[PDB]
Design a protein around this ligand. Structure first.
Ligand SMILES: Cc1cc2nc3c(=O)[nH]c(=O)nc-3n(C[C@H](O)[C@H](O)[C@H](O)COP(=O)(O)OP(=O)(O)OC[C@H]3O[C@@H](n4cnc5c(N)ncnc54)[C@H](O)[C@@H]3O)c2cc1C
Ligand SMILES: Cc1cc2nc3c(=O)[nH]c(=O)nc-3n(C[C@H](O)[C@H](O)[C@H](O)COP(=O)(O)OP(=O)(O)OC[C@H]3O[C@@H](n4cnc5c(N)ncnc54)[C@H](O)[C@@H]3O)c2cc1C
Lengths: 682, 687
């Protein structure tokens, strides 16, 4: 009646049959309402219809093909640069970034980083000028963002490129003093760009005034050749995003007008330097929280769809083997990952909201206009703390996405290794997402230190950010050895407390260690000695914030969905205990007996979520174009489509390799040279 | 005197002056003596110098270029198939796989999987016959291994391809009943193999006798065309190992003679009686070889990427202050040490594992191959050889899984440890990880391999409870722990003791196994064994994991006991670091079990910090101790002499000469775009 080949689409039909809610309600919940789900669906249709942007064949492209295709795609996407608002421009990017991270980046380098920066750091006259030149329209103008150097990436303050003021010419002289200063990883430079935003040390009359930005032209627009003193090359093969043309730039005494420097925050005239002694960087990290979500959901959808139809190994005496989604072991490997992926979106969303509700808080206040007082640096402090929290959020969610890609791949067995299922291509581009815009490990160490700082402010009884006030708290919870009951362990209120408690304890323990250390050591030294502890504190503090933010959203959810989201939220919170059993045991928040009960609670919550997976993955609202993997087809018709794919991209008419005559045949049919041995007397 | 560009080699020479020991003594310790090191060096210069095998341009290769050059490389390695011993063959494949996984696999499917199956499952005459037809020499013959189907990977008993016996003709009819039984991922099938070993359900008189082994010709050897009823295509793009031509195979009423079925253990007469049932799981005998060989790969590839990362750590500076305003060396920041150095210790430990497993595979298959199963006298000899292979199966499986996952993690942590320079193809991490990762899937999916070891460990516990004999490896499961904690803490002296750490680990493992064996007993009262183990799947994983980790820690100490004295203390530091760091991942497990107190965790963290600082002083020596030339590094930032930036800039420019500032799509794509005319929204006229 059905065989292995034909069973899958049928089985996928029973599972979509189990769904107890309206999918689109979960889609509106994720995306933040009916209005936005229709916003993202117009975006998605543009992308998927457009023939130029098609991704069917991207997996077989070699490096040359990818670059050219990315360029064509960028040309295709350019009309939306005039149309799109900041929200839409960014949204278009993130959604297109699920299947094509090369084009996203080749376009983002100009319209997000170059433009971002000359709007951000240029005076209104300047921005206006570059626009007249073609900047925004991208006519005869393509930009790029030259910050990083071969020798410096993380340390902006350490950059060695120089910009020296020459009054006799009224120009800047841009110079790379040696090859260590060579600009590096600059997207669009190798082959695309006609201008960059160079980041350079400001030098005037032999003084260093720190790092500034300059608009350096690289190419003569009309034949694309390099300007005098500009050297550029192609960085070449990368681990991923081979469609982006990252190059190196070296400047040998390049002369630009003084005016080319961007002077919103710092000015030069006639040797005079007037600094008049942020949002972009945070609206960039919050953008990546949402990135982790968009990409993750793709690979979970693939893996979980596959699990609903793949059968291997069953013991139940039934005629057909067990669907791997019905193995609790498999549910453990993926369903808490599905829960996590939900909470990234919440987390991303809440960080945008708290960000706007604080930059409004500062601006609605008169800093200059003291009500006889400026006493509200408290609004200012809350902002810095939010900026700390966004750092851990970027790090752990980009790591989490990375970890989800890898688990989902492994969960599809050998078929996870086929290029047509997307796991290979998708992991590499994403790993670049872990390094740029703040090295995840630097970020976490900074945040941890900031957290210690903040607790010393609490210990000194001063105001701190809303987001870390909780370290000043006393716990609702005390474990006397009398282990926690089920109705506690399934409580969001309880669960939120447990994590805040574990996070507070850690921080307070670190903080104590540090003060005690400081007795024999310097402040910078004492942090180095507590760097593991600092990293842990970033970890626990970000997770708890994520747990809370997920519950805080369920409460506002439509009732029909709510019981299901709660099941997802509980799985995420309890699972999180299991990954950190040692932590909760060290504070004696929980007991051994207790964790064997946690064990059973995730089991039990796995079976519940499991029941509704097709629904909770159809919720992401992805067409098969955005899946871009035959084993994750909405259809479930997995083996049929995968074979079709393999045959479409690789026509098998010929049984021999193109190297058959040159290589294979002459090796299989090789003669033997003689084993005869030279004559010798005696 | 120095700048960012010229500083690294000066720093590397300084770092390398700190070494307290003779590097080659550690290298000898890792290889099992100076003789072994000499043999290892002989293999490596052959690989280094042979211009067909050069990997300089490999990062830049498209799939069609990889495909072709892998074939050339396979050709150039083929003389060694006739002269190599088992040990040389293993080692030549392992060492070459450090930097070229595609050729390693493409050679391996014939010479490891295909050949191993005919030796291990064919009679001596059956083997001699294919030998004489070119099989071993690779003359007019290329083999492959057709086990996996689209439908089935892990469950070999559920394979759907059939081999149904036909007495009228004395043939097997090999048939793929639907697209789901299409053989899948078959290395060499797409383009190169002439013959396959194909696994199928042996059907005689309407009865399935289970999964059996047959040699099936795939192609006409003189023009390479497909034989009648044989259908093949190319699976195409993989995540890595693109030089390997993995194909799919469908059979439609393909006739082979009956003598093509491999009949060392299972037989079928010309009348159709399945003369014997196997009494063996030795249809998959060849798979054990390479699981064993995968423990070593994990060491060899780990040691390559830890050397890249850690040499780079010693020269890269970000954020520091110093007498001349030089920034700090990333290796001097304590977090970076804890990211890498415990992984360095892991890696050293992997080699201890790889060697045990290797010594047993080579020993065990001498015994197996020298036994005749058609001798009644020899029935008690083979009776032990079977249980030897069973134990070996189980031990290899968990060690394969965890060591290949640990390598995956090392490659990945080393990549990030190099920052953005880890993402450059030329520094090797990308091709490396993508090529490495299939090892966690093939020749046994790791998770499923963990489930198999978990089961074997429960069954070993029952033997123990029955007082019956068990391998030295698992004996400790029997004993009572020598440690008890009344909650007053564990001192520093015990926490730096090999005996204590070992015992701590054995205690954590034994208790999980003994508990899991407890639940199983309760379950077998209603359930069958099978259904019980599936209920215990999560438990089986846990046990595999701890016992494996306990095995490696124990094996590392057992070798440190035998070392030259001058190196022993540095090797000791790595061991305890590995051990204590391992407590640090599994902190839950040791507090769950009342082995450590909460107040011991603080202390463990500090000790890790100390051990790191001590191991950091000698990183160049230990990494040097691997014995890798720059060819096997294959990464500018991992250069021996540390001139990271010069070599990195040179590699990039050499592979991408920059004399043209336009792209190949300038005239067709970029210029037309950038110089596109204005869109006229001049509106139509209307009244
Ligand atoms: C694909 C790609 C595209 C890029 N595109 C651009 C671009 O368009 N424009 C641009 O300007 N840049 C670009 N970059 C550069 C990118 O921003 C850098 O890779 C990153 O910002 C910093 O990396 P790094 O190489 O400086 O690493 P480093 O900062 O040197 O870090 C090296 C390692 O040491 C560790 N480390 C560093 N400091 C510390 C510390 N204080 N304590 C402990 N550990 C530490 C880090 O964790 C890291 O693992 C790109 C990079 C990539 C990979
Ligand atoms: C590059 C490459 C080359 C290959 N070359 C060859 C070759 O030359 N010859 C050959 O014969 N084969 C080859 N294979 C096949 C390879 O051995 C299979 O991928 C491997 O055996 C895994 O099988 P599978 O994909 O069927 O996984 P499945 O068994 O289908 O498993 C899918 C997922 O379900 C999980 N799962 C399965 N069963 C259970 C259970 N009982 N409980 C809980 N979870 C479970 C697994 O962990 C896995 O994550 C190759 C594969 C690759 C990727």
């Amino acid at each position: 009646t059905t065989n292995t080949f034909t069973d899958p689409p049928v089985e996928m039909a029973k599972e979509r049959g189990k769904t107890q809610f309206t999918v689109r309600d979960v889609t509106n919940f994720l995306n933040g309402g009916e209005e936005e789900t229709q916003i993202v669906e117009k975006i998605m249709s543009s992308i998927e219809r457009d023939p130029v942007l098609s991704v069917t064949a991207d997996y077989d492209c070699n490096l040359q093909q990818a670059r050219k295709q990315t360029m064509e795609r960028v040309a295709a996407l350019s009309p939306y640069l005039v149309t799109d608002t900041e929200k839409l421009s960014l949204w278009r990017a993130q959604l297109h970034g699920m299947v094509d991270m090369s084009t996203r980046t080749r376009l983002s380098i100009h319209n997000n980083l170059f433009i971002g920066s000359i709007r951000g750091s240029g005076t209104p006259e300047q921005f206006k000028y570059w626009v007249k030149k073609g900047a925004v329209a991208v006519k005869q103008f393509y930009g790029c963002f030259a910050m990083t150097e071969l020798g410096h990436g993380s340390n902006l303050k350490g950059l060695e490129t120089t910009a020296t003021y020459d009054q006799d010419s009224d120009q800047f002289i841009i110079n790379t003093p040696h090859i260590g200063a060579t600009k590096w990883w600059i997207g669009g430079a190798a082959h695309t760009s006609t201008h960059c935003v160079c980041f350079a040390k400001l030098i005037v009359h032999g003084k260093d005034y720190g790092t500034r930005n300059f608009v350096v032209p690289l190419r003569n627009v009309h034949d694309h050749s390099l300007k005098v003193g500009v050297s550029i090359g192609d960085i070449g093969k990368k681990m991923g995003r081979d469609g982006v043309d990252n190059g190196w730039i070296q400047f040998t005494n390049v002369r630009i007008p003084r005016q080319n420097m961007l002077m919103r925050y710092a000015k030069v005239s006639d040797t005079g330097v007037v600094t008049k002694p942020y949002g972009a960087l945070i609206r960039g990290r919050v953008s990546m929280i949402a990135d982790s979500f968009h990409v993750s959901k793709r690979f979970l959808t693939i893996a979980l769809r596959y699990a609903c139809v793949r059968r291997q190994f069953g013991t139940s005496g039934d005629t057909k083997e067990t669907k791997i989604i019905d193995y609790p072991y498999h549910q453990r490997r993926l369903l808490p990952l599905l829960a996590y992926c939900y909470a990234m979106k919440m987390g991303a969303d809440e960080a945008q909201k708290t960000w706007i509700e604080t930059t409004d808080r500062i601006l609605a206040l008169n800093p200059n206009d003291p009500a006889q007082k400026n006493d509200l640096e408290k609004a200012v402090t809350d902002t810095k703390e939010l900026f700390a929290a966004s750092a851990g959020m970027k790090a752990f969610t980009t790591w989490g996405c990375a970890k989800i890609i890898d688990e989902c791949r492994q969960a599809c067995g050998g078929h996870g290794y086929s290029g047509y299922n997307g796991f290979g291509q998708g992991y590499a581009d994403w790993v670049v997402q872990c390094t740029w815009e703040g090295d995840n490990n630097v970020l976490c160490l900074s945040m941890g230190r900031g957290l210690v700082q903040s607790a010393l402010q609490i210990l000194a009884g001063k105001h701190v950010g809303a987001s870390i006030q909780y370290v000043g708290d006393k716990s609702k919870i005390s474990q006397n050895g009398q282990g926690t009951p089920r109705e506690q362990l399934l409580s969001p209120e309880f669960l939120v407390e447990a994590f805040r408690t574990a996070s507070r304890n850690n921080i307070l323990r670190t903080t104590d260690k540090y003060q005690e250390l400081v007795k024999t050591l310097n402040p910078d030294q004492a942090f180095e000695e507590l760097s593991q502890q600092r990293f842990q504190c970033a970890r626990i503090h970000t997770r708890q914030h994520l747990i809370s933010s997920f519950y805080a959203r369920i409460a506002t959810a439509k009732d029909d969905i709510k019981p299901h989201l709660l099941k997802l939220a509980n799985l995420f919170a309890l699972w999180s205990i299991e990954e950190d059993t040692g932590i909760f045991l060290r504070e004696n928040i929980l007991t051994p007996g207790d964790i064997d009960l946690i064990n059973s609670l995730v089991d039990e919550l796995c079976v519940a979520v499991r029941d509704q997976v097709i629904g909770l993955t159809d919720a992401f609202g992805l067409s098969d174009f955005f899946i871009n993997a035959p084993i994750g087809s909405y259809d479930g018709n997995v083996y049929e489509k995968y074979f079709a794919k393999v045959n479409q991209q690789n026509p098998a008419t010929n049984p021999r390799p193109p190297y058959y005559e040159s290589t294979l045949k002459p090796f299989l049919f090789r003669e033997e040279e003689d084993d005869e041995i030279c004559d010798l007397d005696e």
